[PDB]
Scaffold this active site. Sequence first.
Site, PDB file in Angstrom:
ATOM      1  N   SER A 115      23.137  38.745 -36.506  1.00  0.00           N
ATOM      2  CA  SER A 115      23.378  40.204 -36.528  1.00  0.00           C
ATOM      3  C   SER A 115      22.296  40.812 -35.850  1.00  0.00           C
ATOM      4  O   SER A 115      22.246  42.194 -35.691  1.00  0.00           O
ATOM      5  CB  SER A 115      24.249  40.745 -37.542  1.00  0.00           C
ATOM      6  OG  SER A 115      25.355  40.314 -37.504  1.00  0.00           O
ATOM      7  N   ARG A 172      15.541  37.659 -48.092  1.00  0.00           N
ATOM      8  CA  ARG A 172      15.025  38.137 -46.593  1.00  0.00           C
ATOM      9  C   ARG A 172      14.343  39.410 -46.511  1.00  0.00           C
ATOM     10  O   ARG A 172      13.530  39.805 -45.692  1.00  0.00           O
ATOM     11  CB  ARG A 172      16.562  38.291 -45.611  1.00  0.00           C
ATOM     12  CG  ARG A 172      17.022  39.505 -46.051  1.00  0.00           C
ATOM     13  CD  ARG A 172      18.453  39.850 -46.137  1.00  0.00           C
ATOM     14  NE  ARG A 172      19.539  39.346 -45.205  1.00  0.00           N
ATOM     15  CZ  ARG A 172      20.638  39.726 -45.048  1.00  0.00           C
ATOM     16  NH1 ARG A 172      21.601  40.590 -45.518  1.00  0.00           N
ATOM     17  NH2 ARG A 172      21.104  38.999 -43.906  1.00  0.00           N
ATOM     18  N   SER A 202      29.110  45.161 -41.996  1.00  0.00           N
ATOM     19  CA  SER A 202      29.663  44.140 -41.122  1.00  0.00           C
ATOM     20  C   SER A 202      30.697  44.725 -40.133  1.00  0.00           C
ATOM     21  O   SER A 202      31.826  45.339 -40.899  1.00  0.00           O
ATOM     22  CB  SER A 202      30.166  43.191 -42.078  1.00  0.00           C
ATOM     23  OG  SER A 202      30.845  42.125 -41.319  1.00  0.00           O
ATOM     24  N   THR A 207      19.128  43.418 -40.457  1.00  0.00           N
ATOM     25  CA  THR A 207      19.205  41.942 -41.052  1.00  0.00           C
ATOM     26  C   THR A 207      20.147  41.172 -40.187  1.00  0.00           C
ATOM     27  O   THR A 207      20.736  41.803 -39.312  1.00  0.00           O
ATOM     28  CB  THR A 207      19.937  42.026 -42.223  1.00  0.00           C
ATOM     29  OG1 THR A 207      21.210  42.828 -42.299  1.00  0.00           O
ATOM     30  CG2 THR A 207      19.118  42.787 -43.400  1.00  0.00           C
ATOM     31  N   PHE A 214      22.178  37.010 -40.728  1.00  0.00           N
ATOM     32  CA  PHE A 214      22.369  35.874 -41.420  1.00  0.00           C
ATOM     33  C   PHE A 214      23.435  35.053 -40.955  1.00  0.00           C
ATOM     34  O   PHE A 214      24.584  35.556 -40.423  1.00  0.00           O
ATOM     35  CB  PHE A 214      22.932  36.440 -42.732  1.00  0.00           C
ATOM     36  CG  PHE A 214      23.447  35.269 -43.834  1.00  0.00           C
ATOM     37  CD1 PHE A 214      22.907  34.150 -44.167  1.00  0.00           C
ATOM     38  CD2 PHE A 214      24.555  36.115 -44.589  1.00  0.00           C
ATOM     39  CE1 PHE A 214      23.527  33.267 -45.104  1.00  0.00           C
ATOM     40  CE2 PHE A 214      25.096  35.140 -45.544  1.00  0.00           C
ATOM     41  CZ  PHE A 214      24.431  33.962 -45.619  1.00  0.00           C
TER      42      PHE A 214
END
Lengths: 236, 243
Positions: free
Chosen positions: A47, A220, A85, A176, A178
């Site tokens: 992302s 993270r 998201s 971020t 992942f």
Amino acid sequence: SITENTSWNKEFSAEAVNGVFVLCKSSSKSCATNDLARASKEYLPASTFKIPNAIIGLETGVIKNEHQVFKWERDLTLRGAIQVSAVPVFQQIAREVGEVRMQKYLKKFSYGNQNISGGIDKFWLEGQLRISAVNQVEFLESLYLNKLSASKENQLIVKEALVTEAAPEYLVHSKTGFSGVGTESNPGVAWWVGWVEKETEVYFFAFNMDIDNESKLPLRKSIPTKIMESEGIIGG
Amino acid sequence: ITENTSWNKEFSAEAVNGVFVLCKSSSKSCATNDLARASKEYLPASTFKIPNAIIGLETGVIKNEHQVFKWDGKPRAMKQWERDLTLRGAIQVSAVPVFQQIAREVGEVRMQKYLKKFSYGNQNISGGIDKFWLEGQLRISAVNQVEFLESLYLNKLSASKENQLIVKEALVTEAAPEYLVHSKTGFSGVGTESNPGVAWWVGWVEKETEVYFFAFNMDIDNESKLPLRKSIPTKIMESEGII
């Protein structure tokens, strides 16, 4: 010029993980990292690709303006789609942009290996695209400075969408990523990239780590924070 | 624009004479606790940094978003202003001497022009180029602040879209993935018991895909009451589910 600070490995060890942190003061000419080798190794952006994708979306007109609403499980603004998201939103953007245009912008942006094979709506997540922590810092610095090959207006729009922390003399832009929880032998990758404006100074950063355990994801943010704290960046 | 008498409850406890104006989506849908006071004009004090910043950018007085305003080491009225500041920092800490110098460089003729373009209150900049918003004759109402901020939100001011965006980011004060607040405070001083000063909080809130424009002002004669410029409107907004 980038230098190696192996003492930073303590922060990865403590918690038991393999990863890299790149931290630059003022510009990408003054960077330091725990691991020079891994700082240049390229990984799936996941992302963190929404940064270039949003800029390209705006440049090509696929995204109309800063206030476009992406209607649906919920309606989102551009900022909300970047910060939450919102799989389908950016998949739809990528398909609308198309491979030829997408490839041309990644060239202009010098974005990693610029390999977008694997499907126009998943190359940054399951495909062939790869980018290093160093290249992430270089890209983010260009954005900060409005030097990417895109209008200043569109660079500004994306930058406000990336604000994650705000105080009178401390402002953080970040993102971020992942790819998923992988296994011990085939780990996924997790990222945190961005920049910190503290008083009149600016610090560019990029972190990535291998992830093979769902419970390790918060590292993270925590590992970079601890390193930045040790450098005196966080508070006084 | 309807009047919501239930909102007066929030002002009753502290004996505050003030007004809150809140607009959902656009200035075509507003509510206030006091219809009369909503259009009454007051010194903008530091809320003036918003138009001043845009004008500084438009005229080239401020070079770009990354300009650093260097401290000369000479005493300033607040310790928080005794340091190098960015444009966002200077706005956020309300560094008056920074903006006084910007105003001087812009100059009376350009300042008048831009305030006309921006429909900014009574457009009276008499009182000295570096003090008209602080102690001069300039006056603006809460309703006018909401109109002005909506224009800024929409990039509709007569200024470059780049410059409007620069100032917008400089006004961010609260950030979350689906919640964003742009805002600015103001405080003219304590005046007298008889002729009190004014305090302000103005701005907008983006929550999910909605936007709300707001402006608050109150009479103040005791500096201890200052946080009420944020707490009263925050309580009203939270009671409307804007949180």
